[PDB]
Amino acid sequence: PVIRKFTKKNVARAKKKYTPFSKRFKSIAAIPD
DNA sequence: TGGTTTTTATATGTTTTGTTATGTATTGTTTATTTTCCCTTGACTGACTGACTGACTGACTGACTGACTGACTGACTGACTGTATATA
């Protein structure tokens, strides 16, 4: 029923992440080398 | 435990509105010069109206005039009173 007011389909979205490394150890002691 | 949905970050697209610099044309600024009729300056012109010359008829003193009024005085008529006259 809805209509998008303007289309982007030839987009090529890149599979790249927004979570930095700062948020996959969660502590100073929690980090490997 | 385990699969699914909802929101968000990044990335891009869309549209409206407002900012700044500029080159060309119009018009203003200053200064010098000539013409136009409005506004001062003034004698001429025409009616005006103050002092001087005429004048005109009502007011108070000159009392006047003349009839009338007021005191005096004699004339006269009525009331008072004596001389007189008559009778017992």
What torsion do the CA atoms of A18, A24, A27, A29 make, to the nearest 10 degrees?
A: -140
Residue type, position A16, single letter: K
Collect all residues with Cβ–Cβ distance below 8 Å to A25 and sequence separation of at least 6. A31, A32
d(CA A20, CA A33): 17
Contact A25, A31 (CB under 8 A): yes
The token pair that represents A17 in the structure block: 């992440």
Residue A22 beta carbon within 7 A of nucleic strand B? no
Between CA A25 and C1' B65 the distance (Å) reads 176
d(CA A31, CA A33): 7
d(CA A19, CA A26): 12
Residue A21 beta carbon within 7 A of nucleic strand B? no
The token pair that represents A24 in the structure block: 């996959």
Angular region, A26: left φ>0, alpha ψ -120 to 50, beta rest: left
